[PDB]
Amino acid sequence: IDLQGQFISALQSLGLSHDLAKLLWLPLPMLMMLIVATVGVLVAVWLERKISAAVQQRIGPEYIGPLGILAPLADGLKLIFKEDVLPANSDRWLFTLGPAVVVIPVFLSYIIVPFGQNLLISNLAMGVFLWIALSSIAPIGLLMAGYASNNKYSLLGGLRAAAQSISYEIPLALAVLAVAMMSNGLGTVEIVEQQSQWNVWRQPIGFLVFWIAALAECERLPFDLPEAEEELVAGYQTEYAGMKFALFYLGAYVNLVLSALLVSVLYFGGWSFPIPLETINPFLQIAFAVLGITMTLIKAYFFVFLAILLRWTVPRVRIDQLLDLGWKFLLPVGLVNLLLTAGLKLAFPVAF
């Protein structure tokens, strides 16, 4: 229904300087994506907390609210209410700036996830490449948290956070190059409007590549070494007490949600009940919008579910067993996939 048009025209009817009107529509989706991001964090926390109890014949929170619905609310409000402590020789500027640096770009990368056509913020012609770029800023914040702490116990485990995050960006890049072949570019709308009746069937290998490189962004118990609670307590996090630890926590879960939404838009699509949709008009547009949003969230939820379900199925790996995936299983296979897709697009340019 082009809500931008009516918002600007109704607001341009009582004046308000039409350029200013186009300026004043900016913050609405820019904060709506923050709303759904925070909600996705709350949902991811509650989901992990209840499914990690289902796996174990356990029952998660039910005394917080009805079903633990208000558990991360309690967590966040507490961590606001907690004291913050700045240890003895730690720096004052870098300590309270590390978590901001590792948290910000994950939010900033929500300017590309569609949720529906013309239902996103500012489709960039670069798109996913900007995500691959902004994701490489996190190790700076992690090394900042390591250096800005007298805790050798922390820095010894903050360098290995800039060893895996600096290792699973190359195949993460190659698996999306393999999609940039097909889709005439890099914009998400172009990656997905190429699906009108999915890339997973034609990228059976790059799926594993992207999906192993996304889980291994210092997130999950298959690796999550920099928070290896048993190996060395909380790594770089153990001196962060109040809302700063909440920033780290938030950042992990919101990055997981972003990975799920991004696998959805890349390989499956944030539309397309798998029949060739649009074969069957504002009252119909508001229906297909809801349908596309719903199916997007279905696939994102399935990937969040599988991701949390590996956390309780897959014991961790030291650091050498880890880095012998990168450069020895993900990078050669990503190169092979790239060359394969290139050769097939050269021979069979149809279907790509």
- For another protein, the binding residues (CB under 8 A) are 1, 6, 35, 39, 42-43, 46-47, 50-51, 53-59, 62-63, 65-67, 69-70, 73, 88, 282-283, 286, 290, 294, 297-298, 301, 305, 309-310, 312-314, 329
- Residue number, 93 or 283, with CB nearest to another protein: 283
Structure tokens at 104: 């910000």
- Measured distance between the N- and C-terminal CA atoms of the chain, rounded to whole angstroms: 32
Least separation, in Å, of the C-beta of 83 and another protein?
A: 14
Positions of E strands within 125-238: none
| Residue 258 · residue 41 · CB < 8 Å | no
If DSSP codes are grouped into helix, strand and coil, which group holds residue 191? helix
- Residue number, 155 or 306, with CB nearest to another protein: 306
**How far is the C-alpha of 127 from the C-alpha of 138, rounded, in Å?**
19
Half-sphere exposure in the Cβ direction for 51 (13 Å, CA): 18
* Maximum CA extent, the chain: 67
- Residue number, 25 or 312, with CB nearest to another protein: 312
**How far is the C-alpha of 197 from the C-alpha of 114, rounded, in Å?**
18
Least separation, in Å, of the C-beta of 80 and another protein?
A: 17
**How far is the C-alpha of 183 from the C-alpha of 345, rounded, in Å?**
11
Least separation, in Å, of the C-beta of 304 and another protein?
A: 8
- Residue number, 212 or 338, with CB nearest to another protein: 212
Check the CA dihedral 235-210-120-71 and report its sign.
Answer: negative
Least separation, in Å, of the C-beta of 66 and another protein?
A: 5
**How far is the C-alpha of 105 from the C-alpha of 131, rounded, in Å?**
8
Least separation, in Å, of the C-beta of 168 and another protein?
A: 17
**How far is the C-alpha of 239 from the C-alpha of 245, rounded, in Å?**
9
Least separation, in Å, of the C-beta of 352 and another protein?
A: 26
Least separation, in Å, of the C-beta of 62 and another protein?
A: 7
Alpha-helical runs (H) found in 66-134: 71-81, 92-95, 98-108, 128-134
- Residue number, 178 or 333, with CB nearest to another protein: 333
When computed from its CA atoms, the radius of gyration of the chain, rounded to whole angstroms, is 22
**How far is the C-alpha of 263 from the C-alpha of 261, rounded, in Å?**
6
Least separation, in Å, of the C-beta of 43 and another protein?
A: 5
- Residue number, 166 or 287, with CB nearest to another protein: 287
- Residue number, 21 or 260, with CB nearest to another protein: 260
- Residue number, 101 or 246, with CB nearest to another protein: 246
Among 125, 132, 170, which residue's Cα sits nearest to residue 262?
A: 132
CA angle 172, 176, 182 (to 5 degrees): 165
